[PDB]
């Protein structure tokens, strides 16, 4: 088992709305949960977009999840990662 490296990035403000992307990388096995929370609670999957869990060419995997958030509300959001019975949480930077 290799634990994921989790990283949160944010795009520029489109129309007062930021896109936040939570990336998990360099993990094994392939089974992972990666999802956005607001005010400590998981969002609906219909408010998010997920990449596939793809190889990185080193015997490990990588994936991502994104959601759109209104400007000034970024501190309410947390990326939740779960892998092999472990979890980690990651707030929105800047």
């Amino acid at each position: 088992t290799v634990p994921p490296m989790v990283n949160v990035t944010r795009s520029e403000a489109s129309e007062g709305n930021i896109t936040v992307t939570c990336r998990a990388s360099s993990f094994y096995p392939r089974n992972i949960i990666l999802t956005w929370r607001q005010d400590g609670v998981s969002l609906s999957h219909d408010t998010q977009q997920w990449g596939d869990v793809l190889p990185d060419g080193n015997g490990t995997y990588q994936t991502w999840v994104a959601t759109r958030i209104c400007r000034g509300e970024e501190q309410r959001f947390t990326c939740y990662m779960e892998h092999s019975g472990n979890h980690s949480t990651h707030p929105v930077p800047s």
Epitope: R37, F77, N86
Partner: antibody, heavy 117, light 108 residues
């Protein structure tokens, strides 16, 4: 309405194990992460770890990885913190808390753990 | 690991005075900081989150300010119910870390 009610004071022997509880009410138990915190008078507040009561998946402070075990029983809305190989260093007040949007709220009343022969 | 440096460790003030408690983080915590009150080691009570947002039910005399690595809690017109302990906590990275606390005692 939201309440985290912990178990009472514990008087326990060195070398033994003990499990203290945190019973949640007034909200959907599986939706929020439960947090555990240690407090002593000498060396301040320390975060032990978090658990997702929906899946049981844990996020430990590396310092408590050998000492602490976090579990949750979602049928009784109760989270647990178990200590192994108790020493005098474990004598402290232990709090549970609730993870909101990137801050803690709804701290339990605390449970005192006293290790003694 | 973010180290939180809270000063001063103790503070003597009278009713009506204004007091300020500072917390300095070892790295940028992006305003993910909360302040809590604690009386006699009892349940911590949330005062301020996201560095400056005052929590529900908290008197407007409490004021949180800061960004980056520099944060402060100000108590304007200190009341008898404000004597006790205060601590900051950061939520930018795990493990979550706490300031060493400030005991606010009655000056005489």
């Amino acid at each position: 309405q939201v309440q985290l009610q912990q178990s009472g004071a514990e008087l326990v022997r060195p070398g033994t194990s003990v499990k203290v509880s945190c019973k949640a009410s007034g909200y959907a138990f599986t939706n929020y992460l439960i947090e555990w915190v240690k407090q002593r008078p000498g060396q301040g507040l320390e975060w032990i770890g978090a658990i997702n009561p929906g899946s049981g998946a844990t996020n430990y402070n590396e310092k408590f990885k050998d000492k602490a075990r976090l579990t949750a029983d979602k049928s009784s809305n109760t989270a647990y913190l178990q200590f192994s190989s108790l020493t005098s260093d474990d004598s402290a007040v232990y709090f549970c808390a609730r993870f909101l949007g990137n801050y803690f709220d709804n701290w339990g009343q605390g449970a005192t753990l006293t290790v003694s022969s | 690991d973010i180290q939180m440096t809270q000063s001063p460790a103790s503070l003597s003030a009278s009713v009506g005075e204004t007091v300020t408690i500072t917390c300095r983080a070892s790295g940028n915590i992006h305003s993910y900081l909360a302040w809590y009150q604690q009386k006699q080691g009892k349940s911590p009570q949330l005062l301020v989150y996201y560095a400056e947002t005052l929590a529900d039910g908290v008197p407007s005399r409490f004021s949180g300010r800061g960004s980056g690595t520099q944060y402060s809690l100000k108590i304007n017109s200190l009341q008898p119910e404000d004597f006790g302990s205060y601590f900051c906590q950061q939520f930018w990275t795990t493990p979550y870390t706490f300031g060493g606390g400030t005991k606010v005692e009655i000056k005489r």
